Amino acid sequence: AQNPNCNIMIFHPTKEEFNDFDKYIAYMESQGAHRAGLAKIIPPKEWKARETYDNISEILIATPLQQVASGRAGVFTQYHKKKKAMTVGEYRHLANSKKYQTPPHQNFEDLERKYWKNRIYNSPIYGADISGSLFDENTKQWNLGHLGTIQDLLEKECGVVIEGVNTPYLYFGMWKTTFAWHTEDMDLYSINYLHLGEPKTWYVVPPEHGQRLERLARELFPGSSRGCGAFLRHKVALISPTVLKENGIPFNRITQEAGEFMVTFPYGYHAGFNHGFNCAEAINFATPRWIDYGKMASQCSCGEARVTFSMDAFVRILQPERYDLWKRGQD
Ligand SMILES: O=C(O)CNC(=O)C(=O)O
Ligand SMILES: [Mg+2]
Ligand code: NI
Ligand SMILES: [Zn+2]
């Protein structure tokens, strides 16, 4: 079995290997990359996402989210307080202000220590979940707006045509902005490109061990767990690496830098934080190997998780027994 310790793998495809996206995902899996839940892909030196980032300041962040924490430094939840609209240029200035800017630090490890010590005492503002793309239309390789759609993959595998669309999303971050522990909707893959700015640190649990994270989370957030049998779908819970290690949960960590892709694999729980002002683009995708994970994915039906239009058909076709309860949760 390849990669039996479930380490995060890093790939350096050649320009020729960068042509065929599906083929390269399958190659990475042939080497055991999916066992980690997360892989890094460094593009060939000949590639670029677009020519410059000099003209992005007028993008609007219609609903910036202030991420307010509750709990203790290593075990907390966050809620999202909606703020007034602002442009990317306004948000960049805010990120760089004395109130929000990255503190002085020695290296990524020092900054990680500072994150986990101090995150709960601040409320950073995240420009997350903005429909759109920063890839040039002429970028033909690994262009996240030109991937094969999940609806087409379902149709190709299973024969059933379904409604829905699959488009990317932009994330404008600042120091301490946080993504809570989660798997993707319907335990899909994700791919994330860090277009510009400061790094993003990731934590990940191997898919084969995801239920160990779920059992810990039920113990650590006992009210939330009574509320909902899949409350990690709410995307609000944080658990630090120190707490994971104290509880014997297998995990790994890695820092993504500008110009790098990350891929999350089906049922790979992940969480992390931004180092300073940055912009990422991400989208969900599927392969043939995903279908069995989609059929088995948990679902939130308590009302909280509320999701996109296109999840309806995935539940309806892959999980017909759960459909009626899940849809009640949507309504
Ligand atoms: O970058 C973020 O805030 C969160 N991203 C992801 O969870 C992802 O790409 O799958
Ligand atoms: Mg602009
Ligand atoms: Ni994700
Ligand atoms: Zn729920």
The three-state DSSP-derived secondary structure of the chain is: CCCCCCCCEEECCCCCCCCCHHHHHHHHHHCCHHHHCEEEECCCCCCCCCCCCCCCCCCEECCCEEEEEEEECCEEEEEEEECCCEEHHHHHHHHCCCCCCCCCCCCHHHHHHHHHHHHHHCCCEEEEEEECCCCCCCCCCCCCCCCCCHHHHHHHHHCCCCCCCCCCEEEEECCCCEEEEECCHHHCEEEEEEEEECCEEEEEECHHHHHHHHHHHHHHCHHHHHHCCCHHHHCCEEECHHHHHHCCCCCEEEEECCCCEEEECCCCEEEEEECCCEEEEEEEECCCCHHHHHHHCCCCCCCCCCCCCCHHHHHHHHCHHHHHHHHHHHC
Question: How was this entry determined?
Answer: X-ray
Q: Is 194 in the pocket of ligand 1 (CB under 6 A)?
A: no
CATH of residue 163: 2.60.120.650
* Residue range of the domain that includes 313: 1-331
Closest CA to ligand 1's atom 3: 179
Q: Which atom of ligand 1 is nearest to the CA of 190?
A: 10
Tell me whether residue 182 is annotated as binding.
yes
CB atoms within 10 A of CB 330: 14
Pocket test for ligand 1, best of 270, 273, 278, 307 (most atoms within 8 A of CB): 270
Pocket test for ligand 1, best of 130, 170, 179 (most atoms within 8 A of CB): 179
Tell me whether residue 105 is annotated as binding.
no
Task: Report resolution in angstroms.
Answer: 1.2
Tell me whether residue 126 is annotated as binding.
yes
**Domains of the chain: total:** 1
Q: Is 264 in the pocket of ligand 1 (CB under 6 A)?
A: yes
